Amino acid sequence: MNIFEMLRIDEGLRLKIYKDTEGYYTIGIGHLLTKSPSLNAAKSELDKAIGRNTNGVITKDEAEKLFNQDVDAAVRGILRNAKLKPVYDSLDAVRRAALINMVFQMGETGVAGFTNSLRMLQQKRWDEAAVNFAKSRWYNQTPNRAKRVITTFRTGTWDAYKNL
Ligand SMILES: [Cl-]
Ligand SMILES: [Cl-]
Ligand SMILES: [K+]
Numbered sequence: 001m002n003i004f005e006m007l008r009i010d011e012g013l014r015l016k017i018y019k020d021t022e023g024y025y026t027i028g029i030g031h032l033l034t035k036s037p038s039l040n041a042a043k044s045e046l047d048k049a050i051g052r053n054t055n056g057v058i059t060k061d062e063a064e065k066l067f068n069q070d071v072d073a074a075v076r077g078i079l080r081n082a083k084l085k086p087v088y089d090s091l092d093a094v095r096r097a098a099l100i101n102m103v104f105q106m107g108e109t110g111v112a113g114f115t116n117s118l119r120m121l122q123q124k125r126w127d128e129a130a131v132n133f134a135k136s137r138w139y140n141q142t143p144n145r146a147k148r149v150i151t152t153f154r155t156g157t158w159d160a161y162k163n164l
Helices: 003-011 039-050 060-079 085-090 093-112 115-122 126-133 137-141 143-155
Strands: 014-019 025-028
Touching: 003 060, 003 093, 003 143, 014 039, 025 039, 025 060, 039 060, 060 085, 060 093, 085 093, 085 115, 093 115, 093 137, 093 143, 115 126, 126 143, 137 143
Parallel strands: none
Antiparallel strands: 014 025
């Protein structure tokens, strides 16, 4: 298990444009295209991302390509965010993956808003942090996923992803 397998499990793989949990056009492995309600706009963002006129369909390789770029960007975003970096640097590898997972799903801003939970992680109060993370819209709207990520922060193991 690693960040890519982890996020591949949580985001799936779809080769045609689809709407994510929030109703937003996305494709591949959770690659958000736009928050616009316009499919055409999404198609535009897609072609731009791929570098060709796709007609809302991409190949597996292309999806993996955006996914790799997306994971990298997420980590890189973590490293440039003063709110996230210290916490990230304080964590072990497994837990770091959990934080990358959240940032990929909701943006570094979204993540930086978990100030208090983040502080608990830095203090290494695992149980406490986990309780706190659950008090969020994130957990209420995507509870299974959230539970997995929270389990990962609580234990520092991949138990929630093993056998999935
Ligand atoms: Cl892109
Ligand atoms: Cl979920
Ligand atoms: K998805």
